[model samples]
Target: STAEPDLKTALKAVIPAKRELFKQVKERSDEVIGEVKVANVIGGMRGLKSMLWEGSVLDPEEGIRFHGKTIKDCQKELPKGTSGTEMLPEAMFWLLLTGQVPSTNQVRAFSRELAEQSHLPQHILDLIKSFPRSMHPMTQLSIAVAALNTESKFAKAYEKGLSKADYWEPTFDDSISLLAKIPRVAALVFRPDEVDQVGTQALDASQDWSYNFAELLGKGGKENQDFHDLLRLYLALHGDHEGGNVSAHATHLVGSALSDPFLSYSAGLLGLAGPLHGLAAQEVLRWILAMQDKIGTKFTDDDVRNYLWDTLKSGRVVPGYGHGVLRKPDPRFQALMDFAATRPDVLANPVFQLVKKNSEIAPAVLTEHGKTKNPHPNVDAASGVLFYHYGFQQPLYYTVTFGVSRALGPLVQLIWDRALGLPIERPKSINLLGLKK
Candidate 1:
């Protein structure tokens, strides 16, 4: 408890205002939020604003604002990692939770707290190492995360009947514990052959959170500075988009039922396993690589255009071209592009070069195709390709890394949900005949 009192102290002061806001909002229950038509209910509740999310909001034209700041604003404003190329994901976590950029001391201390408590339980390590290489990484991650719930502080405390007023405290504790252990758990999934070695290794408390995570995932600490920089940027950018995303929404819905952070976030990871969700990162890379194999990277714009036409003619939509909400190019995609633009070696990689080329060409093709809504690249369009160039070649394991980064925002909201005494999330349903009434 003493190791991470800063977050609790901040939350203690922040909670009352949130609770008051909640009360005011609830008092206006009669006010119409949105009209739920058949399209909304059948279309997967795509635009209905029924849920409340604290960390970040997505704007159609502008992209995600982590507490109202753009990706560019965050890159300019948040504390940077040792490389100074990207912002620390821990700093991003602080902004997501507190809505203010953390000081250097605060960010370092937060990183240290995660490093300190990051040890995996022996059984959790055993479970991870037990998995076969053929087992999907996201599957391994989700199961292992679920296994960590055996030590859930909230689970045991709730069994003992504490007052609901004090509920957020243990949830906060569990959240820190979960976040701390998640990197090790996720890294172990990446390098299962080194599980025994990494499981016993103590994380260097002096290094920032993302650096250690990158080093572990890269395995054996060979100063891959660029790789570390990409990890920092990827983790920060992927941390949380908005609550309506399947992963974040699943976490909130599960947490609403009083499941502890471990179980709740495990549910989130399960949702992240879907191809339409977090798997898009690697899927985009797969499609790009498939293009590389077929076209051999020596083609003109017509070749790229024909490839797009062929993919479209084959009835397969471009995986990374469109978005549910964004009208402009995703700022996250632009952020990754910006990161690659700095690294000469990354830019030199043919795979990365092809992605850059596609980013330039795909919009024009998709616009002419006239089927895609956004037509601009989203974050997934360029994210996994950078990793591919960094030598993490296994496309299937990409989502697990994304799962590690995504744990921040939803878990932060879970803590806030308890603090605000939000009830279990149940919405009214309408059937075919009931719609007429």
Candidate 2:
């Protein structure tokens, strides 16, 4: 038997720290809130700490750290599933919520808990299957998530006069429910045959949560080590990137209204569906292939460089090069690159080879061009190549993969939001004339 406390029980000890934070905020409210920068107001509210987001923090130079742990640190400390080289999503979720590394047994127990609750209702499966295969996977994911709100415990509990302090409980249930059901939804959305797999697939208590998801995505059964490792790393790496990103902010913004996790996360996924956000992975892949098509097999360093300049002169920003927040190469991109080194197949991939060479060359080119502050590859630079290697060639399905992993961060933020009684997110705005004045 696992001696480790379950999630709710574990949270008992953790909740006091959050309550203390609330206490300090009430007593010292004036210390934190002060003048706002006009530039930030007009520049998309960048760097404003108007709310609490527990999952992770993004540093302009350092990339993202989950509760002060870097991706490398997480890779070292977080528990991995049996025979896996990457951090498990179960352990990452525990760290996100509790801000501590969980024991392997605790991770196992939590994984089992998720698997036990992973089944989707019949109607939800039908809803997912009803979507046309031609539909963008992100839209299908968004609709599937919205429909899952029908089973939200928070909605039912709130209607029955649930106590304010206890809001976290039903939210917790809804969060777990959302997390459990997403992989199934994702599978059916991309590979509809997996709908049958959903009902017939037995939850393997011994496997990691992501391994189970990879299996449904048609990776694990073949024991394709590269694909399996890619899934683990991709999910763990993309799990969260602080609370300010569109998806995280949207989820937190909606969750502030006391919407259940399903509805809140669904809203977030819609934001992610936009081309400016999650779809960048596909855009990156497309740009790489288009360059390949134009140049054919004669892709030299000079040829690649010339093509880059041509694209830039055409008034197009390089798809995966610049980041609004990160001023260095995204550590997530490096992590995926490192994974590529472990598998020669990935390194030999023509698309990946071009991507790798471009990463080395693009920074210097962009720096010379003087258009970008960071001039380094973000996660989008490396993600799609690995997917292309793994036979996940449907470029549109990439963001759906992102949505599945990203659910961990904002959903945790929402749980804490209710626990701390974080208010509805309403940021003040300034008109352009007022700014000029």
Candidate 3:
């Protein structure tokens, strides 16, 4: 692999580390907020006001930006597509990982590294095969990840005498390996185990990194290429933004606790599963289709209130609208808008047009009348249309694709942790709830 800019080492080394004493204290407070479900929605349908140590980030406002650049700027300034105007999503992945965009040459090198890193062990395929056909793919994914730990070097090392400060790199390496290979593994599970003749397609080494995800699914063609581009860019944009997102924070917090990346990321994955967060994608589409069915394909402006009042009364937040933090339409949603406009059917879909229209007024009415912070559509709002435009029908599996794409960023953090030989445990405490008693 071409040498990564020395920036990775420089950036990593400058951050000093401190030791955390091990503790065995705990037990007591379990004041539970009720579980998140489709029946009850969490706010921040926009963005959160206060910080959540473990939550998903909904970044971007009008245009998708990394750090601060719009998607167009990233395509122009970062290592780019073979076409020059479009940046490779793999390059975007690298930029999100290291906070330093790559040159075209650097992106090529990383692509090769990722290509080399693809392919799961046969046993992993065996484990995937063990799942019943009726099992949800997300359940399969959770298990697939945990099962992969049998090959974890950091996990083994930590179980031995490894210092809290010394285990990050190996964990990072496994994370990289996991991110590199997971898409292929995800595709592999779709293979029918009983029919050897029906399975095992070879990857076209000539396609770019994003195309490989399509090829692995055995669904590659021109249309698949479009889906591949869509999924790749969508994944790239959604992957990581800084340190507080569920997967990112969970990994960081776990690292801070000196928990290895695997365990910490799993905790973060649970956070991502909250319907108010990553699972919002699932709710977004379901809500749209249900609205379309109830009101028919066409919507007058009045349809918005009928849907809105019904939604509010039923105790669900409108999935694709309103954010916790953003006062404007989410840049991620806007980015998808930019992409979706390219598809003719998306422009023709009445629901799509209705959503775009209603999304604007819903926030206005809510804030004006209800005296609440309801502004702008977050990422989940626009995503379903893209998948629907592409002919996908399953909303439940929507976030599964998110899990597939998100693997890149967290694994990169694990790499950063390993290379730095960062400290073993993160430590934090909360105020006592029982003080009054």
Candidate 4:
């Protein structure tokens, strides 16, 4: 059965490892109390960075391995052994968490598990339907997630439980519930009820997750199933890149304070809504399309090079290139490339070639000033052309799909907390600047 009671049995053997990790997490929390000086928390963006870079343990220089291979080695191992479709990013998530290469049975199980978790309350849909189509999709996402706090069972239970240690349980549950409902919320949010529609319609359950996404985005076809698989593995892999990313950190921060899942997840969602991070994918694609629109023709390689130089001269950092965290090419980017290899025609697109060429040159340029200590092209820079080929235009919707996929991990964490009696009320002190100091 795809829908098992919970993850307890599967996770039993890993309890000791999880406990050790939790021990490290606790020590890190103590470090925060001593070191964190800022007032009002500002939702702890620094903590997020600390989690991934300082604590989460994925450093390319240390030769982080995946699927029994290095990141480059993983590119050669795509599903079905197809060239170009294997992305270490996808492999990383499943492997690091599960401790094994996902068999076809496990992958199907994972897909079905997600499918089983897919339902959103009709009231939530109504809330979305009520929003005017003219609103930024991210704004709608924020409001929707904020609204979900009203429904958190764990939060409600916490008010009655009155125990500090039991907080993480409800925090976990709310996170999971929020994650389950986000894709439906996202799918409905951009569905064209007005101008410039992507030809979206209602969802179909019989199809896999990405197929349903394609249906909502008006892109479903025979290739949609394969695309769905790609998107699923892509999202699963990127969802929890350790506990340090802004959204993940927000979740951990709030979880630490014993916030309910919904409220905690909303905090995380707010962090993800930032353009410097998750929305960077949209910017990457839009920047290219805008350049093409202005030039009014596909430029030659030299023209593309000149344009890139001009772009840097304009003082705007190019989107989708370079990593703040990953020293190698973002595994997510490699994963997408692996997926694209299934169809060779996808590589022929001029835009895709331009992206690749620029990606190859990016690290070398940045390395000159000793600033590129570890600059590598990220997935956002690489994914635009493939998404364009798949008939998507509104790049903003890119990470909305990411948000939907990521809901799984935090929620799973929430549920486990409940089963284990973690506390919910996370009250911490913030140092306010003294008057006349």
Please give the RMSD to the true structure for each candidate, in Å.
2.4, 2.3, 7.1, 5.6
Evaluation by lDDT, superior candidate among 2 and 4: 2
TM-score of each: 0.94, 0.93, 0.77, 0.74
How well does candidate 4 match the true structure, expressed as C-alpha RMSD?
Answer: 5.6
In order of TM-score, best first, we have 1, 2, 3, 4
Worst 10 residues of 2 by lDDT: 192-201
Please write out the lDDT profile of model 3 over residues 1-437, one tens digit for every residue: 53655423533553342111111111322445345432222332223232222112334343345555666566457664443223566776666555566677766666666667676666777777778888776666667766777777777887787875556557656676676666676665555363232224455454556667766655567756567667766777677655556666666666555555556566666566666557777677777778788888766778777777777766666666665555677666666677667777777887687667767667865665463465567778878777777776666667767877776666666555554544554333333453224
Candidate that beats the other on lDDT, 2 or 3, i.e. the better one: 2
Give the best candidate by TM-score.
Answer: 1
Which of the predicted structures, 1 or 3, would earn the higher TM-score when compared with the native? Answer: 1
Off by over 4 Å in 4: 1-6, 20-56, 62-103, 149-153, 156-177, 192-207, 221-223, 290-302, 324-326, 366-373, 412-437
Model 3 global lDDT (CA atoms, 0 to 1): 0.62
Worst 10 residues of 1 by lDDT: 1-10
Q: Please give the range of 10 consecutive residues that has the lowest summed lDDT in model 4.
A: 80-89
Best by lDDT: 1
After superposing candidate 3 on the true structure, give the runs of residues whose Cα lies further than 4 Å from its correct spot.
1-65, 70-72, 80-87, 156-169, 189-200, 255-264, 274-276, 309-316, 417-433
Evaluated against the true structure, the overall lDDT of model 4 is 0.57
Alpha carbon lDDT at 188, candidate 2: 79
List model 2 lDDT by residue over 355-387, tens digit each. 888998889988898887778998889899789
